Write an enzyme that holds these catalytic residues in place. Structure first.
Site, mmCIF file in Angstrom:
data_model
loop_
_atom_site.group_PDB
_atom_site.id
_atom_site.type_symbol
_atom_site.label_atom_id
_atom_site.label_comp_id
_atom_site.label_asym_id
_atom_site.label_seq_id
_atom_site.Cartn_x
_atom_site.Cartn_y
_atom_site.Cartn_z
ATOM 1 N N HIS A 123 13.364 0.952 -68.088
ATOM 2 C CA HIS A 123 11.845 0.796 -68.239
ATOM 3 C C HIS A 123 11.668 -0.564 -67.386
ATOM 4 O O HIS A 123 10.488 -1.004 -67.131
ATOM 5 C CB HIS A 123 11.114 0.820 -69.586
ATOM 6 C CG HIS A 123 11.217 2.321 -69.767
ATOM 7 N ND1 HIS A 123 12.536 2.506 -70.914
ATOM 8 C CD2 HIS A 123 10.933 3.621 -69.680
ATOM 9 C CE1 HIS A 123 12.453 3.778 -71.014
ATOM 10 N NE2 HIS A 123 11.288 4.375 -70.484
ATOM 11 N N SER A 150 30.099 -10.872 -24.047
ATOM 12 C CA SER A 150 29.987 -9.703 -23.288
ATOM 13 C C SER A 150 30.399 -9.896 -21.882
ATOM 14 O O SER A 150 31.097 -8.785 -21.273
ATOM 15 C CB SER A 150 28.357 -9.102 -23.312
ATOM 16 O OG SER A 150 27.645 -10.557 -22.964
HETATM 17 N N1 LIG Z 1 24.835 -5.252 -18.948
HETATM 18 C C1 LIG Z 1 25.092 -6.076 -17.942
HETATM 19 N N2 LIG Z 1 25.833 -5.768 -16.992
HETATM 20 C C2 LIG Z 1 26.165 -6.474 -16.067
HETATM 21 N N3 LIG Z 1 26.029 -8.013 -15.979
HETATM 22 C C3 LIG Z 1 25.482 -8.265 -17.325
HETATM 23 C C4 LIG Z 1 24.953 -7.654 -18.313
HETATM 24 N N4 LIG Z 1 24.490 -8.376 -19.190
HETATM 25 C C5 LIG Z 1 24.625 -9.590 -18.685
HETATM 26 N N5 LIG Z 1 25.015 -9.659 -17.449
HETATM 27 C C6 LIG Z 1 25.359 -11.002 -16.630
HETATM 28 O O1 LIG Z 1 26.342 -11.896 -17.494
HETATM 29 C C7 LIG Z 1 25.798 -13.120 -17.453
HETATM 30 C C8 LIG Z 1 26.054 -13.571 -18.776
HETATM 31 O O2 LIG Z 1 26.297 -14.731 -19.048
HETATM 32 P P1 LIG Z 1 27.193 -15.393 -20.103
HETATM 33 O O3 LIG Z 1 27.744 -17.054 -19.669
HETATM 34 O O4 LIG Z 1 28.228 -14.670 -20.350
HETATM 35 O O5 LIG Z 1 26.102 -15.628 -21.221
HETATM 36 P P2 LIG Z 1 25.906 -14.822 -22.146
HETATM 37 O O6 LIG Z 1 25.454 -13.424 -21.642
HETATM 38 O O7 LIG Z 1 24.837 -15.117 -23.491
HETATM 39 N N6 LIG Z 1 27.205 -14.180 -23.174
HETATM 40 P P3 LIG Z 1 27.306 -14.053 -24.781
HETATM 41 O O8 LIG Z 1 26.919 -15.124 -25.498
HETATM 42 O O9 LIG Z 1 28.561 -13.010 -25.400
HETATM 43 O O10 LIG Z 1 25.936 -13.103 -25.469
HETATM 44 C C9 LIG Z 1 24.335 -12.871 -16.976
HETATM 45 O O11 LIG Z 1 24.441 -13.863 -15.693
HETATM 46 C C10 LIG Z 1 24.276 -11.799 -16.366
HETATM 47 O O12 LIG Z 1 24.235 -11.732 -15.020
HETATM 48 O O1 LIG Z 2 10.667 6.210 -68.759
HETATM 49 C C1 LIG Z 2 10.922 5.822 -70.335
HETATM 50 C C2 LIG Z 2 9.820 6.076 -71.256
HETATM 51 O O2 LIG Z 2 10.045 6.135 -72.523
HETATM 52 C C3 LIG Z 2 12.076 6.608 -70.783
HETATM 53 O O3 LIG Z 2 11.950 8.038 -70.818
#
Ligand SMILES: Nc1ncnc2c1ncn2[C@@H]1O[C@H](COP(=O)(O)OP(=O)(O)NP(=O)(O)O)[C@@H](O)[C@H]1O
Ligand SMILES: O=C(CO)CO
Ligand SMILES: Nc1ncnc2c1ncn2[C@@H]1O[C@H](COP(=O)(O)OP(=O)(O)NP(=O)(O)O)[C@@H](O)[C@H]1O
Ligand SMILES: O=C(CO)CO
Ligand SMILES: [Mg+2]
Ligand SMILES: [Mg+2]
Ligand SMILES: [Mg+2]
Ligand SMILES: [Mg+2]
Lengths: 537, 537
Positions: free
Chosen positions: B220, B431
């Site tokens: 409870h 990435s």
């Molecule tokens: N889905 C995608 N497809 C292609 N290019 C991408 C995508 N996402 C990001 N980019 C490119 O990747 C670059 C990412 O720069 P980066 O120096 O790797 O920093 P970051 O994206 O923050 N890596 P992280 O810290 O792991 O998120 C950006 O300039 C984008 O041009």
């Molecule tokens: O919920 C409680 C009331 O007594 C246990 O049934």
């Protein structure tokens, strides 16, 4: 500070796999031997002949996905840390470990992390001859303005379908096709009152909107779309339904899956089910999947609604039973039915009678109590809620009245008791009333089955103890009643003897205070009653 | 302010009965027609012949008890408001409505309220000829110093047994006997990190002990016994086991039921299962019942452990399948097993080669990027985490090195790509690394399957888009790559043409800032590369 049951932070994920296994209903789960930083679970009955359906994602969604592994669904599941995709190394080790020549279909939740990791994987896999295929699932409709729909609760339905065709022995290309079909006929929407707690010390509590509810809160805890100005079940569920109906065909049967994000009470989950039942969505639901925690977000206090259109094959595959750990079995929305009974009224019947003797007692007893009111209230004040005297008087005044209006069955005790029993609870609320009812009620059923006045009283007491839980020595009216009744069972006509017994017991209750000002109201009440009787015989 | 999904406060209880019904797996639940203040659920397949087993208690414990109604267990369940026993009126209406001549056995949880109310009931019932019997259950061992052990989680096991004998057609007196037997062989202990939320506005949050855990917190929400100085799964579970072993026979097989009080994550529940598995209690567990929410306390973040000795008949009745809504099916603690696979190493094989042409590019490309580091970091700073230049250089310096150490398969592109793909992710995290890996990796598998350099590059891109989710116009390196690659697919030898295309695309990313200082690092990186190539051909 936080709020998480866990041992070694670094063994978190692992430990969850273990316990997931230690509870397998079909004992069909097994960890795949590998480096500790790679946590994979694979079905023991591996059939490299059929196309293997691999899935994964971070931890904290539980049972997803180790939960849906086995015959009829997932072949293996790749688990990464809490709310974080697995390594590429792991998604690969998984493909190899369980993919045959028929190929494998990766079913991935729409998030840049999982996509990127499972993707490079699928590539390095293609290169080793493995026929790989990846299906990104995005069913969230909570943020139409966003390029990539988040993947949630609905994902598992995509599995149910993919798994179906997989076991039947179909070609990889046929799995994918049918898999995507379901996906594109799946729509999910979630709501939450507060985010989830994490396995680490953090600044402040989980996101929370006092009195309000966040719509479309991500399973990772992401920020949702809007914020509803209420927490009202009906309102909130209806709104969700609209937005759901808004993206579903104008016609088509469907199954709806009610998912518990992890922290909603079973009770609440039930109301929400009643809400959706009375929802403008009812007239098209041939199946319900839930309430249940299928794809959660740790202990997030939120639930989700996933709708899937039954066009063609989909339904056939949903309903097919499988051999997983947590997959629920679709159930058509039942209809509440009202069963009726031949319910006999309890209202005790009686025919008024006169009886100079009994009436003299009922009068004396009832009156005796009626005067004490003030004093008993005083005693009950230093002890409890200062309501005894008044409570006990209500019951007295009531029977006293019924006495005066000539409406009491004085000639038949077994009936008079039964009547008093069936009336005290009404005039007097609180445990006393019920106890004082149990007394007479049980008493009258002893008199009824042919017994003397003292044997009934003593039994009415035995019952009062059984249900009331009180014994002699607990500072209760039992402390004076018993002695008194035990004295009448010996010398049935000696009222002084019984009086004294009560007065002694009533006094013991005085020797264990924690507040003759420490006296238990019940005891006194009792004693003064037997005193009244004695000063007249 | 609170946190509860509910509509009309006064329809709370009712609404929960409805949703409990709307989800009946066996469509065997039905509400008993009666005044609205009496909420009773009874099995549709009423068999007055067998002794009826009635149970109940307040709401909020959910599935208990409507969840355990049906063939093999409870005949009916009497539900009172949230955390409050039903009325006497209701416990009675229930006995009459479903009790036959074989009688009925009320199974009540040890609390003065339920006892008093169900008690007076059982009495008023005896008086109408109904052969009634009441069994108070108290399994909590959290407060040995208290007269009356609270009734919790274990209660349902008492049902499983009572129900067994009931359906077999045994005499009331035999049911009770066997029922009490199980009860006295049942021991439960609970723990909680925080209490539960209620369906009403309240002063402050639920009881909570930062970093600590309350042991013996009542269903409870009552105050427990002690407070453990940690939240550690292993520690906490072990302690509970001791206190459990301390009250269990020194020998005897048993089943253990792991109950989720309502607010523990499925994941956490799993760890706790792993904890109890490695518990000094393991060596005597032939069965596991849970993890599952069987007898909850709204959303209380706590779990319970109930042990029951298997002496005689008990086990036989546990395992017997029944037709209830939420009753779990006992499962022997499985043993984690490690399946092994024939896991082929992915490490790309290659034999060093020289190639004046290709090397000139690998050198020029790699070098080009390597210088930008600073500037790309600057651009990434006004846009993201100022790590681009450095990230991209890592990948360059790495391949640049491998170039100089004569360790590159320059003679075979499909292999050089595949190698670069399998190396960038390492030198560069984030990435980008993975994207840049998806590129070459997918590229090399296009060259491999006999294709020209531009068709592979273009495909390596198509994949980068598929997994990366980015299209042209998203301010990404895709904005310069595509145009550039689309230009080479037309005029394969015109590097100026492709350069210009990239430079134009790289410029578009400049026209949609929210921070030529708004330029996307990726795009630039790309463009300057094709510029390098052009100023040499
Ligand atoms: N889905 C995608 N497809 C292609 N290019 C991408 C995508 N996402 C990001 N980019 C490119 O990747 C670059 C990412 O720069 P980066 O120096 O790797 O920093 P970051 O994206 O923050 N890596 P992280 O810290 O792991 O998120 C950006 O300039 C984008 O041009
Ligand atoms: O919920 C409680 C009331 O007594 C246990 O049934
Ligand atoms: N088994 C029992 N448990 C509790 N109280 C008992 C029991 N037997 C007798 N009593 C008496 O119950 C009396 C309580 O006085 P009462 O007029 O009912 O107000 P209250 O019980 O304190 N408030 P409430 O809980 O709303 O009924 C005490 O004087 C006790 O003597
Ligand atoms: O948990 C989330 C991590 O990406 C979804 O898997
Ligand atoms: Mg009082
Ligand atoms: Mg009171
Ligand atoms: Mg960056
Ligand atoms: Mg980075």
């Amino acid at each position: 500070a936080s709020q998480f049951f866990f041992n070694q932070r670094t063994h978190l994920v692992s430990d969850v796999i273990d316990g997931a296994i230690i509870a397998s209903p079909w004992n069909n789960l097994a960890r795949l031997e590998s480096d500790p930083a790679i946590r994979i679970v694979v079905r023991r009955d591996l059939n490299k002949n059929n196309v293997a359906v691999i899935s994964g994602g971070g931890s904290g969604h539980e049972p997803a996905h180790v939960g849906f592994i086995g015959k009829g669904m997932l072949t293996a599941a790749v688990c990464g840390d809490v709310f974080a995709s697995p390594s590429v190394d792991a998604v690969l080790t998984a493909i190899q470990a369980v993919t045959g020549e028929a190929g494998c279909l990766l079913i991935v939740k729409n998030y840049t992390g999982d996509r990127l990791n499972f993707g490079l994987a699928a590539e390095k896999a293609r290169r080793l001859g493995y026929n790989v295929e990846m299906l990104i699932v995005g069913d969230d409709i909570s943020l139409p303005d966003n390029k990539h729909p988040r993947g949630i609760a609905g994902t598992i339905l995509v599995h149910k379908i993919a798994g179906y065709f997989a076991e039947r022995g179909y070609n990889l290309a046929t799995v994918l096709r049918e898999a995507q079909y379901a996906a594109s006929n799946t729509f999910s929407l979630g709501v939450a009152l507060s985010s989830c707690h994490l396995p680490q010390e953090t600044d402040a509590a989980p996101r929370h909107h006092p009195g309000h509810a966040e719509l479309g809160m991500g399973i990772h805890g992401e920020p949702g779309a809007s914020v509803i100005d209420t927490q009202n079940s009906a309102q909130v569920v209806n709104l969700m339904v609209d937005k759901l109906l808004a993206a579903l065909p104008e016609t088509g049967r469907l199954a709806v899956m009610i998912n518990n994000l992890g922290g909603v009470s079973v009770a609440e989950m039930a109301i929400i089910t009643r809400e959706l039942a009375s929802s403008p969505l009812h007239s098209r639901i041939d199946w319900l999947i839930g309430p249940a925690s299928l794809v959660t977000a740790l202990d997030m206090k939120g639930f989700s609604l996933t709708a899937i259109v039954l066009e063609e094959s989909i339904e056939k595959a949903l309903l097919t039973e499988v051999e997983t750990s947590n997959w629920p079995t679709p159930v058509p929305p039942r209809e509440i039915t009202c069963v009726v009974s031949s319910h006999a009224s309890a209202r005790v019947e009686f025919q008024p009678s006169a009886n100079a003797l009994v009436a003299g007692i009922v009068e004396l007893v009832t009156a005796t109590l009626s005067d004490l009111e003030t004093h008993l209230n005083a005693l009950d004040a230093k002890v409890g809620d200062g309501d005894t005297g008044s409570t006990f008087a209500a019951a007295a005044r009531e029977i006293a009245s019924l006495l005066h209006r000539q409406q009491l069955p004085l000639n038949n005790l077994a009936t008079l008791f039964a009547l008093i029993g069936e009336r005290l609870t009404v005039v007097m609320g609180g445990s006393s009333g019920v106890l004082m009812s149990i007394f007479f009620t049980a008493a009258g059923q002893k008199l009824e089955q042919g017994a003397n006045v003292v044997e009934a009283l003593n039994t009415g007491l035995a019952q009062m103890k059984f249900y009331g839980g009180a014994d002699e020595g607990d500072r209760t009216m039992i402390d004076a009643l018993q002695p008194a009744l035990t004295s009448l069972l010996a010398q049935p006509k000696n009222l002084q003897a019984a009086f004294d017994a009560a007065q002694a017991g009533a006094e013991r209750t005085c020797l264990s205070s924690k507040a003759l000002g420490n006296m238990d109201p019940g005891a006194q009440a009792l004693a003064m009653v037997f005193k009244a009787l004695a000063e007249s015989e």
